[PDB]
């Protein structure tokens, strides 16, 4: 007979894309609308990357690549994790995927069985629960508080661990909070994975957008249980290039590669050779990370001063380019707050799907002029 | 707690990997061996397509695209399916995917519920059975015969249908047979679909590499039951660009896009604009296609005369760029034959995984000088 599978029918939308869409329906239809949505840098990919791409095009590098990625990228990846993150990884333990999104999707398919519990910390990125449910697993949430700086307490994590616990997902720097978890917390969370035998999944894609504090990889402390997910998307503004990477135990990496062969075969060969340039032309890429980071700090400090002056509450971020704002003064519910803000002229993402109620997500990957218009209209809706 | 998923533990090992671990150790030896194992054109991506990618870079089209593909590509796709295939689809009934591979994966993931049966025709492309068993479905293989020219008998297909049949996959021009299905046969298969109510999955990625016959799309006959898969891979020598596309009922096409967001998000943006060039610039593309098709023709006949001349049987191909040669004179089986050929300095793919037993797959997408060099070496083992 005909009809769609249950697994695809049970899946809910994503406001993180349903808002950016809508904004354009209305903005392509006119209307001065300031957007504070968006999960990508306003910057365009560094020029040294664009040329590495053109060189590949000219060298005729347009052929099929191995499901785990070109050998050269896999070697530059091991070197990246080793020097930047201090992870003892060989090239066999690295994999190139179609964005970090696919590094998370292929992992869940190669590790989850129906009924397997996955602990996700709220607020969390919209896709985590969806990627878990699609694979057959069940989502176990463990809340982190605004008054804790949105930093999880391993005690509370420990209390969620049942015998069905297959994986734990940690993401630092975090979306949507903007929190940077300290070495001790990530280290405590890894100990728990080693003691209660489960996988620790670490999404570190915002690694280089760090203002204060330092980035730590829990993989140092638990290499046989940790799968470190990352990608070129946030760091070098290559969102549309679809290039992510992950490292972990040889058996899980090889299982993730099998799924790839089955699905995408392997990531676009041009984008791979271009990413090799971002990882191996250190002095030109660093100047890129430095430029963007100072421009994001400036954007953050300016947003925060204006929020505080308007009487709005928001926990100060240390990474990423997101801000969770308590919509308490605007409306009795984040969904209603967004409605009122949209009328007022500003697009923003409701925190309902992030299991961040009474909150909204503002992104500062836009110019300081737009941030001012938004602080202007926020003062209008009051 | 830890360990891989049931679906990954249950994947069947590859036999082509056993031979294509033995080749590379003759290669690492330094042994000069030509390879008729090519699953991709030998021609590079035409300059107009390359220019387009260079322009998209310069235009700074390096950001997120819709999960279903850029609006501009779905419009052209709608146009390509109508003008080139007789399929009356709308841009809403089209989808851009990371290769033709992903169009097929997302599909089985959007229609198969555990236990659902999918009828496959053998010899079959290695990945079909694997993608069906990954969504919990079961493979029901029906055999197409050499004595019958690898064209499916609708009656033999009608007998395998049960109340649990959800899909049927036809592939014409075929991999690995090269056969092209006559309009009459394709209509009979699309009558079964409509009659017993089930999806018909038609893989047409080898559409323009046809040397004799006429390419018919059964979707033209059973529009509500057919999902048509295609790609830029073979036609425009764009295998490493990773672009594919499909068309079918809006219900399935919408579910497939749901599976994309939660996994790959959307295919590379640069590679999407290049495809828009290959598809809209009809004058330049038509020229690459006809020039290449004529190259394949000459190379095919070059091969076919030699085998007959050597007494090696192979059912003459009318599409794609593959040949199935009966390996009885070489050795007791496909695998033993292939290893025996490796020692004579040729590298071929065993039909084992294709469920083309006793046969070996040759690929004529390589120079004519290598075709003559392979031909001489065969003779040596005969
Ligand atoms: C926390 C987190 N992890 C992974 C990704 C996926 O990145 P790639 O697939 O692009 O490499 C993201 C990405 N993106 C934005 C926009 C979106 O909805 O994808 C966001 O989360 O707002 C994030 O954060
Ligand atoms: C019949 C058939 N359908 C789909 C594909 C895959 O297409 P793309 O991902 O390239 O667009 C194939 C393709 N290709 C080769 C090599 C491979 O592993 O992708 C093959 O089948 O041997 C075929 O035949």
In short:
Chains A, B: Its EC number is 2.6.1.1, 2.6.1.78. Two copies of one chain form a homodimer. Chain A has 382 residues and is of the alpha/beta class.
Explain what you see.
2 copies of one chain form a homodimer. Chain A is α/β, with parallel strands linked by helices and 382 residues long. The first copy, chain A, has 2 domains: 1-62 and 282-381, Aspartate Aminotransferase, domain 1; 63-281, Type I PLP-dependent aspartate aminotransferase-like (Major domain) (Aspartate Aminotransferase, domain 2), CATH 3.40.640. Chain A contains 14 helices and 12 strands. Chains A and B meet through helix 1, helix 3, helix 5, helix 6 and helix 10 of A and helix 1, helix 4, helix 6, helix 7 and helix 11 of B. The site of a molecule of 2 linked components (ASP-PLP) has 13 residues of chain B, from helix 6. A molecule of 2 linked components (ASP-PLP) binds next to helix 6 of chain B. Chains A, B: Its EC number is 2.6.1.1, 2.6.1.78.
Strand content of chain A: 5-15%
Q: Supply the helix-strand structural class of chain A.
A: alpha/beta
The side-by-side strand order for the widest beta sheet of chain A comes to 2-8-7-6-5-3-4
Could you state the oligomeric state of the chains shown? Answer: homodimer
Q: Which topology of the largest domain in chain A does CATH recognise?
A: Aspartate Aminotransferase, domain 2
Supply Rg of chain A.
Answer: 21 Å
Total DSSP E strands of chain A:
12
Main beta sheet of chain A, described? 7 strands, mixed
At CATH's second level, what is the architecture of the largest domain in chain A?
3-Layer(aba) Sandwich
Q: Helical residue percent of chain A?
A: 40-55%
**Helix and strand run of chain A:** HHEHHEHEHEHEHEEHEHHHEHEEEH
The CATH C-level name of the largest domain in chain A is Alpha Beta
Under CATH, the homologous superfamily of the largest domain in chain A reads Type I PLP-dependent aspartate aminotransferase-like (Major domain)
Coarse shape of chain A? globular
Helical segment count of chain A: 14
Protein name (chains A, B): Aspartate/prephenate aminotransferase
Pfam family, one (chains A, B): Aminotran_1_2
GO biological process, one term (chains A, B): amino acid metabolic process
Family (chains A, B): Belongs to the class-I pyridoxal-phosphate-dependent aminotransferase family.
